[PDB]
Amino acid sequence: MRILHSMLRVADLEAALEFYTRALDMRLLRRRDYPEGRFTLAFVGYQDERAAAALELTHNWDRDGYTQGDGYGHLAIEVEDAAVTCARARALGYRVTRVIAFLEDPDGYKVELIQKGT
Amino acid sequence: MRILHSMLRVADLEAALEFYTRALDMRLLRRRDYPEGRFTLAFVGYQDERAAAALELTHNWDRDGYTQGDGYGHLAIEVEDAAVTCARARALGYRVTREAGLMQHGRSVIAFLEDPDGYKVELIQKGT
Numbered sequence: 001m002r003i004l005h006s007m008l009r010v011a012d013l014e015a016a017l018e019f020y021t022r023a024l025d026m027r028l029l030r031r032r033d034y035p036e037g038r039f040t041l042a043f044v045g046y047q048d049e050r051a052a053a054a055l056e057l058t059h060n061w062d063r064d065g066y067t068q069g070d071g072y073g074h075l076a077i078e079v080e081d082a083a084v085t086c087a088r089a090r091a092l093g094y095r096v097t098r099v100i101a102f103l104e105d106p107d108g109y110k111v112e113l114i115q116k117g118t
Numbered sequence: 119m120r121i122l123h124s125m126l127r128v129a130d131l132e133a134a135l136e137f138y139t140r141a142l143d144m145r146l147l148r149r150r151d152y153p154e155g156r157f158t159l160a161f162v163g164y165q166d167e168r169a170a171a172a173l174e175l176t177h178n179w180d181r182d183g184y185t186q187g188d189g190y191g192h193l194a195i196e197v198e199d200a201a202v203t204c205a206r207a208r209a210l211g212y213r214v215t216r217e218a219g220l221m222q223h224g225r226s227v228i229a230f231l232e233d234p235d236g237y238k239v240e241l242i243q244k245g246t
């Protein structure tokens with residue numbers, strides 16, 4: 001048994017993918033369009049889906065936004081240098097919280113940066 | 119880089135832990151009370167935190183429940199037998215919102231479980 005992925009709904013897939021590939025070093029593992037359901041799925045990550053947990057991004061073409069609650073916490077990512085990754089995301093124009101840093105993606109989801117070791 | 123974990127706030131940590139450890143066969147990797155912040159956290163998974171992504175569960179002492187939005191999707195888990203996991207969660211009293219269905223090639227064997235807080239757990243059968 002193993003954890004395969006966590007899924008999040010996004011209002012703009014291309015903005016979501018820019019954050020996960022520019023502010024973070026994720027690779028597009030697979031993307032799939034379903035016109036019959038008017039949505040697109042994209043899997044982003046590091047290793048192959050067969051080898052590690054990925055992030056699933058759902059984009060329902062008809063939704064302008066999603067009401068995030070206070071139940072969902074965050075997605076934690078292991079980084080080499082927390083301050084650097086945080087500075088790079090700040091420089092790209094992304095929101096940052098003001099060894100451990102917090103970013104938020106274009107939809108408002110929180111990403112926890114944890115420096116390898118700790 | 120690598121994904122370490124996903125975090126969810128639970129109204130009752132004991133109820134949440136019983137579902138993940140009993141219905142889903144996860145092990146308790148970490149648990150700590152923080153009286154200074156009035157919260158407790160727990161880490162559940164299948165492998166060591168150094169090797170794989172885990173699930174972090176938080177319970178804030180001053181809360182009796184959480185407003186779950188429509189943004190968060192689900193946590194997906196790989197299972198040997200989705201029919202068996204469904205029957206097992208149901209035998210313990212948990213809700214299966216979508217049964218696995220007849221196991222056959224090349225049908226996608228996917229099931230949906232609901233945890234005690236109403237979070238969605240997607241069960242994908244190994245081999246699909």
Ligand code: NI
Binds near residue numbers: 011061
């Ligand atoms: Ni859109």
Ligand code: NI
Binds near residue numbers: 112125174
């Ligand atoms: Ni965390």
Ligand code: NI
Binds near residue numbers: 005056192194240
């Ligand atoms: Ni999924």
